[PDB]
Write a protein that binds this ligand. Sequence first.
Ligand SMILES: [Ca+2]
Length: 278
Amino acid sequence: PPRTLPGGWVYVWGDEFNGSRIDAKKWKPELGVIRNQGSQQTYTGRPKNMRLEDGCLVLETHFEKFANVNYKKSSADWIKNTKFMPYTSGSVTTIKTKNFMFGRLEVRAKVPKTKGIWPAIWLLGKNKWGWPVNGEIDMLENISQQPDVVYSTFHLSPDGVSTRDASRGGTVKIENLSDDFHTYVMEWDKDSIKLMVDDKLVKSIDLNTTNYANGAGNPFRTPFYLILNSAVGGTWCEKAPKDGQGYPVKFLIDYVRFYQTKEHAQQAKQFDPETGLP
Ligand SMILES: [Ca+2]
């Protein structure tokens, strides 16, 4: 786990996942049905779905009918009224363990390949806004139909006012992307965000264009928490088969490394994290 990188970067936080077990002061399981009224999976902290094998985090998706721990808890009717899901999988979140604000975030991962799988590396902004105004940085999203295509994608409202999703995203095709591990990299100042695979640029954003109207002030100059997950289905994503053909399937994260220059820790201290204003 290098401490340096040329550019006077320096390791600040991460996980090579070499432990006896997932480190609870670094990751927490998401539990139950969380998102996407078209999804087919419920999320569990059970090693079945979540564990360290061969020095990766393993998020492992099983065709398996399983009760939704949110079956009558949470304020979304379709979650609140869905007793069971076919399909269990894993999701870890730093929501409660680590927030990131400026730096370079390196995530190395091999992705599953079967009908309906939706592996994702992504971050949500913690600030006075709710989705999508808070912000969302999708380093990776992949879907079954188009399995060699990497989507990286920013989500945010057009001004501070409208809560419509004025998203900006790019794509690269990597041929047989499921064969090898690829490094997903986000560089982030208070002036831009770069989202790469494998040193190929998927999407840049200039943050001098994501200012929100009046005061409000920029969702991308607040801290963001990290999510590693495999969903199943989606309103757009091939749905996984009624009978679970192709499953089980694994999403392997070799490592998560966060780095910061003197510069990136400097810029952080100089913005109201609740708003992104100077
Ligand atoms: Ca590792």
